[PDB]
Structures are given as C-alpha cells and as structure tokens.
Amino acid sequence: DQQYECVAEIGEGAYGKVFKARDLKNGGRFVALKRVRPLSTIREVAVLRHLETFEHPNVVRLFDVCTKLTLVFEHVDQDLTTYLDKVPEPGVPTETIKDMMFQLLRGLDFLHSHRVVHRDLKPQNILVTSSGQIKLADFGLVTLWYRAPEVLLQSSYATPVDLWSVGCIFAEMFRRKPLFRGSSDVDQLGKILDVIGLPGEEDWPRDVALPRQAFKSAQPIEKFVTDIDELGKDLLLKCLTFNPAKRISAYSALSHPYFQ
Numbered sequence: 001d002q003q004y005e006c007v008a009e010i011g012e013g014a015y016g017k018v019f020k021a022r023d024l025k026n027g028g029r030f031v032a033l034k035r036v037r038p039l040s041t042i043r044e045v046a047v048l049r050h051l052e053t054f055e056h057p058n059v060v061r062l063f064d065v066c067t068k069l070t071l072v073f074e075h076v077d078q079d080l081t082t083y084l085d086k087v088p089e090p091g092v093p094t095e096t097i098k099d100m101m102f103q104l105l106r107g108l109d110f111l112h113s114h115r116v117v118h119r120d121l122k123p124q125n126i127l128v129t130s131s132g133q134i135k136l137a138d139f140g141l142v143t144l145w146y147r148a149p150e151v152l153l154q155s156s157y158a159t160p161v162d163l164w165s166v167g168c169i170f171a172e173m174f175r176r177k178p179l180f181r182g183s184s185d186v187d188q189l190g191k192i193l194d195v196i197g198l199p200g201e202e203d204w205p206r207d208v209a210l211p212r213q214a215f216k217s218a219q220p221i222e223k224f225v226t227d228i229d230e231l232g233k234d235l236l237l238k239c240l241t242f243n244p245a246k247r248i249s250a251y252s253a254l255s256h257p258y259f260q
C-alpha cells in the first residue's frame with residue numbers, strides 16, 4: 001500500500017515474507033506488513049478483526065487490511081530468539097522466566113477462550129518489546145522442535161498443541177537451547193519419548209500410522225532443565241504430558257503455585 005513504506009526484511013518462510021515498514025501517515029511509526037499472493041477463509045480474518053476488539057496486552061495489534069493483500073500490524077523490537085541470544089550468563093533471571101511465562105499463558109488463555117489455536121508456537125514468533133512485554137504473533141493464516149506429539153502422530157490438533165510448545169519454550173528459557181531438537185516427525189517423537197518416557201498403551205492414540213511398539217524409560221527433568229524448582233518442574237511436566245487430554249490448559253496453568 002502507499003500509506004506505508006518497506007525499509008528492512010523481518011522474516012522469510014513458506015507462509016510469505018514479513019517486512020519492517022514506516023507508517024508515514026501515522027507519524028512514521030514502525031509497522032510490520034505481510035502480503036498474500038475465498039469463502040471459508042473469510043472467517044480467519046473475521047476472528048482476528050474480532051480478537052482485535054479485546055486488545056489483549058499479550059497479542060500483536062492489527063492496524064489494517066488492504067488489496068492479493070497487505071496485512072499491517074504493530075512492529076515489535078525483537079523476538080524471544082534474539083532476546084535469548086543477547087542475555088548475559090548464567091542466562092535469564094528466575095523471575096524474568098516466571099514473568100515472561102505468565103504473559104505467554106495469558107495470551108494463550110486469551111486465544112483458546114476465543115476458539116483460536118496458535119499451531120506454530122516458537123521463540124521465533126514470541127515477540128518482546130523494549131519494556132520486556134510478551135506479544136504472541138504469526139497466527140490467522142521447517143522446525144518440529146516445538147511440535148506436540150499428537151500433531152507429529154497426526155491424530156488430534158486441538159488447543160493442547162500450544163501447551164506442549166509452551167513447555168518446550170519454558171525449558172529453552174532456562175537451558176537457552178531447544179530441549180527436543182529432532183529432524184523429522186519420527187526423529188522428534190523419538191527425542192521426546194527419550195526424555196518423558198514411553199507413555200502407557202492407554203494414552204497412545206487409537207488408530208494412527210506410528211505404533212507405541214516402534215520406540216524408552218522415563219528420564220528425570222532436573223537433568224535436562226538444570227536449575228528449576230519443584231514447582232516449575234511440576235508445571236513444565238504438566239505442560240509436557242503425552243496425552244493432550246491430560247495436558248494442562250493455559251487457564252489452570254495461569255493458576256498453578258509457580259506464579260503465587
């Protein structure tokens with residue numbers, strides 16, 4: 001659009017490239033824009049232009065949709081990735097991990113309550129403002145490291161998909177490196193079960209291509225996620241529960257003694 005001007009390139013990918021641009025009309029503020037190169041997809045934008053009306057403090061603001069499209073949003077300074085890349089030793093402060101995780105679950109509880117699933121939650125799209133405020137981005141239409149077991153298996157794809165990704169990002173917050181760094185669904189699933197263990201046959205998805213009988217003893221987490229309290233250990237384990245039905249929800253997670 002002519003109401004905006006491209007200065008730099010934020011990110012590239014299959015979904016299309018997003019750019020940092022100057023919103024000349026609105027006091028030359030920095031805005032993030034992404035193009036698109038038509039009936040059941042009308043909903044996607046109707047849910048976002050609606051989600052917008054609640055202006056949740058932990059989700060990127062949308063500014064406009066122009067025409068073949070141009071999507072303008074709020075520009076955030078950096079992501080969680082480059083945030084972790086610059087934090088001095090011995091990593092992120094206990095309280096900084098606990099705070100940023102709250103803002104993450106709030107934005108997740110907001111999206112879930114409004115029947116929205118992120119589906120691709122990674123540090124690359126968990127943005128962080130100058131003030132240090134978490135903003136969820138890259139939703140309302142690679143790296144399997146954050147993919148949930150059931151997505152990998154191709155069974156369910158419901159809201160517990162993001163609670164796995166959050167336990168993966170919660171670990172990476174301490175560790176400062178991906179917990180499960182697989183290279184294929186089968187490799188990912190593997191590396192996952194090498195840590196959490198083989199779940200009971202009762203929790204394995206009934207009727208899927210990959211059987212339980214194709215993989216492991218449960219390993220303690222304090223080994224892989226170094227200096228984490230028994231409370232954070234309790235929360236992250238509930239986040240990383242094989243059975244999506246047993247996996248904690250952002251709403252019960254927002255309650256947990258870890259934030260008390």
Ligand SMILES: CC(=O)c1c(C)c2cnc(Nc3ccc(N4CCNCC4)cn3)nc2n(C2CCCC2)c1=O
Nearest residue numbers: 010011018032073074075076078079082124125137138
């Ligand atoms: C489509 C989006 O929701 C969206 C928005 C609105 C956005 C806003 N500010 C960003 N701000 C950032 C975040 C990081 C950078 N750097 C990119 C170059 N390397 C250093 C970090 C620059 N700007 N980045 C944004 N993204 C990126 C997240 C991952 C994919 C693109 C987005 O998807």
